[PDB]
Ligand binder design. Structure first.
Ligand SMILES: Cn1cc(-c2ccc3c(c2)[nH]c2c(C(N)=O)cnc(NC4CCCCC4)c23)cn1
Length: 287
């Protein structure tokens, strides 16, 4: 049932490439008539034991999760020669929130942007109740089912919190909280930070010039060296350097962003909290 047969998975197109993963659109079509279900398939870009072990854990993790705003696990598919291992998932027809927002911005108002925001908060809340830290939260990882539902769509860098400890110690630096940057410590709090950045991406409607890597580079200066970029970002963050209130953004909204971007871990709000505020802010909007 959870087992998918490699010969019946017809390739259709590529959808994209993540950290070490690759994503394909496939039809699972045993009857050979093309009536089978279109599904999304993630596999190791280039397989090795460590990545496989990691990937199997990613799989156990997604298997772990039932939620409205988390993409649906379907099953797995073992390749002959055990060369690939594939994660089978429900196909969401609009791609990532990044690209969806990128080109249907005309019909996306602040109101919708908050429906999207609460949904993401709830997913993370639930993620949170399972003691899982996403670590890689961003519009490019959030997927659009239809205009009224988005789901967290990748968990390729998701980790389990050790039984006692409240953080994990071990990519995309402009979404990272500072203690993740300096101490490599990830937690529910570092996810709230990144979520602040997602909130930002949202109300920038993904102008390419207004992306976080761009805006921060506009600070770090595009003249700096290599590793020198992190180091300057840190310093900048240490002294409360922050992304700007995007054009047209309500300070009520921006205020959450900066609340999430708190140098002090514990002062950062909870997803529980965040979801409620957003929802209330939403209700108010009446026009
Ligand atoms: C032409 N056409 C393409 C799309 C469009 C293209 C992109 C994606 C797509 C539909 N549906 C998904 C699925 C899903 N579970 O079905 C999972 N992740 C994807 N992208 C990942 C790439 C790596 C980074 C993480 C996200 C895609 C819509 N129309």
């Amino acid at each position: 049932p959870t087992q998918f047969e490699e010969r019946h998975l017809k390739f259709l197109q590529q959808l994209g490439k993540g950290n070490f993963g690759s994503v394909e659109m496939c039809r699972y079509d045993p009857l050979q008539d093309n009536t089978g279900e279109v599904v999304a398939v993630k596999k190791l870009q280039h397989s090795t034991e460590e990545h496989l072990r990691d990937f199997e854990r990613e799989i156990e993790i997604l298997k772990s999760l039932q939620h409205d705003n988390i993409v649906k696990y379907k099953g797995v598919c073992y390749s002959a020669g055990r060369r690939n291992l594939k994660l089978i998932m429900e196909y969401l027809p609009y791609g990532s929130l990044r690209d969806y927002l990128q080109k249907h911005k005309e019909r996306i108002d602040h109101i919708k942007l908050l429906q999207y925001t609460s949904q993401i908060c709830k997913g993370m809340e639930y993620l949170g109740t399972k003691r899982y830290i996403h670590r890689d939260l961003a519009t490019r990882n959030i997927l659009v089912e239809n205009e009224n539902r988005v789901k967290i769509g990748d968990f390729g860098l998701t980790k389990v919190l050790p039984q006692d400890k409240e953080y994990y110690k071990v990519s995309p630096i402009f979404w990272y909280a500072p203690e993740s940057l300096t101490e490599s410590k990830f937690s529910v709090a570092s996810d709230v930070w990144s979520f602040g950045v997602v909130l930002y991406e949202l109300f920038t409607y993904i102008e390419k010039s207004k992306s976080p890597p761009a805006e921060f580079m506009r600070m770090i200066g595009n003249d700096k060296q290599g590793q020198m970029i992190v180091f300057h970002l840190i310093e900048l963050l240490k002294n409360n350097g922050r992304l700007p209130r995007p054009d047209g953004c309500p300070d009520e909204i921006y205020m959450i962003m900066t609340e999430c971007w708190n140098n002090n871990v514990n002062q950062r709000p909870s997803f529980r909290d965040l979801a409620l505020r957003v929802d209330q802010i939403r209700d108010n909007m009446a026009g």
